[PDB]
Every structure is written in structure tokens, then in C-alpha cells.
Enzyme design. Structure first.
Site, PDB file in Angstrom:
ATOM      1  N   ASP A 110      38.795  48.453  85.599  1.00  0.00           N
ATOM      2  CA  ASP A 110      39.490  49.199  86.631  1.00  0.00           C
ATOM      3  C   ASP A 110      39.442  50.706  86.395  1.00  0.00           C
ATOM      4  OD1 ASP A 110      41.505  49.389  88.937  1.00  0.00           O
ATOM      5  OD2 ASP A 110      42.664  50.289  87.303  1.00  0.00           O
TER       6      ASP A 110
ATOM      7  N   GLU B 244      34.302  49.573  87.813  1.00  0.00           N
ATOM      8  CA  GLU B 244      34.674  49.998  89.161  1.00  0.00           C
ATOM      9  C   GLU B 244      34.517  51.502  89.259  1.00  0.00           C
ATOM     10  OE1 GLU B 244      38.876  50.807  90.249  1.00  0.00           O
ATOM     11  OE2 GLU B 244      38.341  50.294  92.319  1.00  0.00           O
TER      12      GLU B 244
END
Ligand SMILES: *[C@@H]1O[C@H](CO)[C@@H](O)[C@H](O)[C@H]1NC(C)=O
Ligand SMILES: [Ca+2]
EC number: 3.2.1.1
Length: 496
Positions: free
Chosen positions: A197, A233
Site C-alpha cells: 500500500d 501500489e
């Protein structure tokens, strides 16, 4: 770190957004394994802040309090139980790793966490890890507010707070070690990889330093020397000092331009047409296929919270969504991730959805179980896109044509196109405002094939459209612009 580690013949992972561990365990055995799904992206399994204003939003899970496996999805035993059962049936688990930050600096100190751990954002104290003020970038960030203020400054993007979220000092060996401790616990439990993330907000070098501390996958389920699958990401559209290519040495990266452009093409925005997809892939400025994790929509941008904006296609646009997912699953580019969501009371005002914060279906904060209806659809507001005949069958389609080349392309210069995957599959699309009726070369062997979009092959017969391929591989297709699903797909395993 580039190989998914799925077992031979399974080519996609599904994001079971906000599902409980017990439900995912059941889904692995009753549906995912039988249908050939390769793996599951789970929501952050570590303790997060319990936010009550608004009431338990989905994003509270991207606000870490500790690394204890204790969330609304379940506790540590349930998590281990899920990983074990899924692995035993050949379905991998990929963890959403939130390692760039802890919670918002404005959050109130106390025990308002999913496991009761005490934390004090104000004084930078997270005793459950433990972390202290010495473990954050407060002194390193050079902006006046302490938050990221300008994305044209690559340094600030990495060292300052993403909208107030306390930023971890990832260059310190102590912090790197606490994070690797968390990740190695998961690897040894049996997880096959991680979604990193907010990777854009971390230095490529710091990520690499953490990865070097990671174990090889559990030798009880994976061959010796297996490294965890890593997908970063990174939202990289046009011109920014930071490029997704800067992260290639660490693993794959999410290609957000993919869903963005497929959306504008299928919606036919600003003159774009499907005939342009002829050179879909790197030709469109996307990252190399072997470094790409692709998807039509993600939990972020399906509610306007990520790259793409309004062009993104979601389950709300059912008809066009199925067609986009179909193209993705049929095209050879990248490794595919299928979305699985829940319905929320969308409420647009001045163009923006005011309820984009709404968390998963629940009863007083307790996430609802996924109920299966007699027609295989889901209840309790879970959309279960992965169970839609159209999507589930294209998932299988990708498995059947894996490794097969992109060939036999056809287009009418507008929006009706078709292409094949070697001699194992063929797919046709009609996105024009008029019917399609033509004979195409399929490259498939002679025979009768069941169209897997409109129906299924069920013991010597098709429940939907049937296509007949002649000796020279030619076949006739008819799709009226009025069909429920304006596309047809047939493959080696739908042959009668
Ligand atoms: C296919 O369906 C027809 C009835 O529509 C039936 O006569 C035939 O035996 C079926 N074939 C198989 C292989 O089940
Ligand atoms: Ca950072």
C-alpha cells in the site's frame, strides 16, 4: 518477487474487499478452487483505528495501530485457519500491507482500536508495536504543514504525511525490522505475497531494504526458494517526477493507466473507439507486461478515491463493466485482478458521491456474513462480481488460453472488434450502435462451441448461444447492439 506463485493453470486473483476470514475460507473451498481462481487479495489483517465519525468507514483499515492480526475481519486464529484451508485447496492469499504509515496525526489517543491496543497519535506512541516519536519522519519532512503539499517534489512525497497519516522513518533499521517481523510472521503462516500500500510514498531503496529481510515462502506448501509475490501500489499517470518504473527492482506495480483508458475507450469518451485497442499494452505507454498488475477497477477508484476519476467502470455500470472485464481477461497483457465489492448507498451531490466512505455491510459495526443465494449470487449486499457467470467464465477462459499468442485480430474501424488466443480461444465484441453479423477466422479447430458469456456448457449441451467453426477455422457471429451482453467468447474447453 514477480511470480504470483499461484498453482499451475490459475491466472487471476480476486479482491474480496472487506470480507471476514471465515467467509473467505469457505469461499476458497466451495467456489474459488472449483472455478480455477488463483488467489485472494485480503483487506489489511492488522489492527486499525476504530473510527466512529463517520461510522466505521472502509478507509479506517488503512490507519494502522499495531501489527496484531485482529480486525473486523477476524482474529489471528481465524486468519491462520483461512490461509491453511485456502492453501490446501490451491488458492493463494495475498496480504494488503500498510507499511508506509500508522494512523492520522489528528486521531484521539486512547483505545479506540479494533483490538483495544492503546495508542497516542499526538505523542507518536504506539506501544503495541512498539513505535515512538523517534520512528517517524516529523523531523525529516520539510513542508510547513508537515503533510505532502506538492507532488512535483519527489522528496516531500516520500518524507511527509499523506493527508495527515503519521509517516514511518523507513530508513531506520529498527522500523525496517519491525515491519519485516510482521511480514515474516505472515509468510511463515502461509501467505504467498503482498500488495504494498502507498508504495509511491516510500523510497524504492527503503522498500528493497525491507524485502531483503523477507523469508522464502512456507516450504510445506511451496517449492524451496520461492520468493513472495510483490506488487507495488503506485498511481502513475502522466508527468510526475516519480515513475512506476523506479520500483521495478522490487516487484510488479499496479498499472492504473490500464483501467483508466479501458474506461474511456469503452465509454467512447472524446472519440476513442475499440478499434484502437489493436496495440493495447506497452504500445499505450503502459509498463512492461511482466511488471504489471492490472484491473478494471479497485476498491479505491471504484468510489472515486483513486486514479482514473469518472471514467472508471464498476459494477454500477454492469453491462459495460462485464465487457471491460471480458476484454481484460482475454488480453495477454499483465497479471489480472478481479474486483469483488459490496453495494453502498451512492448519493451524488454536485457530481460527488457523499457516501463514498460507507464501510462493508454490517449490523452495529459487525460485518455481515456472505450469504449465498440459490442462483449462486450473494446476499447481504455483497455484489460478488466474481460469481457473475460472465466474469467467472472469463476467469476460466484466461486459464484455458494461458501462454497462447495474441492473434487473428479484426476490427471494423469503429467499435466492433475480435481477436483470438492461439488456437485455444476467440472473443468478439460489439460496442457500436448497430448490429454485428459477420464471418470471422477464429484459428480454432472445427466443431460446435458453447458461448460462455450467454450460457454454459453443461453435459454435451450449451445453455446459451452456440457457435459453429468450420474446417478452415471460420465461424459466423451475430451480436445485436441490443444483446444483454454485447460480446461472445468461446474456448477449447467450451467445445462440444
Ligand atoms: C442435449 O440436449 C438434447 C435436448 O435438447 C438431448 O436430446 C440430448 O441427448 C442432449 N445431449 C447430451 C449429450 O446430454
Ligand atoms: Ca513515506
Amino acid at each position: 518477487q514477480y511470480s504470483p506463485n499461484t498453482q499451475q493453470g490459475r491466472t487471476s486473483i480476486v479482491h474480496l474487499f472487506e470480507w471476514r476470514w471465515v467467509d473467505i475460507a469457505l469461499e476458497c473451498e466451495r467456489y474459488l478452487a472449483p472455478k480455477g481462481f488463483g488467489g485472494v487479495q485480503v483487506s489489511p489483517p492488522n489492527e486499525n483505528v476504530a473510527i466512529y465519525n463517520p461510522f466505521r468507514p472502509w478507509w479506517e483499515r488503512y490507519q494502522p495501530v499495531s501489527y496484531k492480526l485482529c480486525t473486523r475481519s477476524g482474529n489471528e486464529d481465524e486468519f491462520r485457519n483461512m490461509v491453511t484451508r485456502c492453501n490446501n485447496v490451491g488458492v493463494r492469499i495475498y496480504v494488503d500491507a500498510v507499511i508506509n504509515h500508522m494512523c492520522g496525526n489528528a486521531v484521539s489517543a486512547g483505545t479506540s482500536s479494533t483490538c483495544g491496543s492503546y495508542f497516542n497519535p499526538g505523542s507518536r506512541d504506539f506501544p503495541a508495536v512498539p513505535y515512538s516519536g523517534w520512528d517517524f519522519n516529523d523531523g525529516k519532512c520539510k513542508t510547513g504543514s508537515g503533510d505532502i503539499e506538492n507532488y512535483n517534489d519527489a522528496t516531500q512525497v516520500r518524507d511527509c504525511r499523506l493527508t495527515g497519516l503519521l509517516d514511518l522513518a523507513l530508513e531506520k533499521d529498527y522500523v525496517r525490522s519491525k515491519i519485516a517481523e510482521y511480514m515474516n510472521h505472515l509468510i511463515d503462516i502461509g501467505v504467498a505475497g503482498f500488495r504494498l500500500d502507498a508504495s509511491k510514498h516510500m523510497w524504492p531503496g527503503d522498500i528493497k531494504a525491507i524485502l531483503d529481510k523477507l523469508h522464502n515462502l512456507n516450504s510445506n506448501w511451496f517449492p524451496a526458494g520461492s520468493k513472495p509475490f510483490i506488487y507495488q501500489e503506485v498511481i502513475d499517470l502522466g508527468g510526475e517526477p516519480i515513475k512506476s518504473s523506479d520500483y521495478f527492482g522490487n516487484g510488479r506495480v499496479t498499472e492504473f493507466k490500464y483501467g483508466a483508458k479501458l474506461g474511456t475507450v469503452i465509454r467512447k469518451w472524446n472519440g476513442e473507439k475499440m478499434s484502437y485497442l489493436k496495440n493495447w499494452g506497452e504500445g499505450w505507454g503502459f509498463v512492461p507486461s511482466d511488471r504489471a498488475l492490472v484491473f478494471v477497477d479497485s476498491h479505491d477508484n471504484q468510489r472515486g478515491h483513486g486514479a482514473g476519476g469518472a471514467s472508471i467502470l464498476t459494477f454500477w455500470d454492469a453491462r459495460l463493466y462485464k465487457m471491460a472485464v471480458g476484454f481484460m481477461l482475454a488480453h495477454p497483457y499483465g497479471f489480472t485482478r478481479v474486483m469483488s465489492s459490496y453495494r453502498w448507498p451512492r448519493q451524488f451531490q454536485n457530481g460527488n458521491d457523499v457516501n463514498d466512505w460507507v464501510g462493508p455491510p454490517n449490523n452495529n459495526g459487525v460485518i455481515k456474513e456472505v450469504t449465498i443465494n440459490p442462483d449462486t449470487t450473494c446476499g447481504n449486499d455483497w455484489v460478488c462480481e466474481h460469481r457473475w457467470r460472465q466474469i467467472r467464465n472469463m476467469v476460466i477462459f484466461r486459464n484455458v488460453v494461458d501462454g497462447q499468442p495474441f492473434t487473428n485480430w479484426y476490427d471494423n474501424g469503429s467499435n466492433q472488434v475480435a481477436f483470438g488466443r492461439g488456437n485455444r480461444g476467440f472473443i468478439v465484441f460489439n460496442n457500436d450502435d448497430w448490429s454485428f453479423s459477420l464471418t470471422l477466422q477464429t484459428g480454432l479447430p472445427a466443431g460446435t462451441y458453447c458461448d460462455v458469456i450467454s450460457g454454459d456448457k453443461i453435459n454435451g449441451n450449451c445453455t446459451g448461444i452456440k457457435i459453429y467453426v468450420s474446417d478452415d477455422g471460420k465461424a459466423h457471429f451475430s451480436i445485436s447492439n441490443s444483446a444483454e451482453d454485447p460480446f461472445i467468447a468461446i474456448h477449447a474447453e467450451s467445445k462440444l
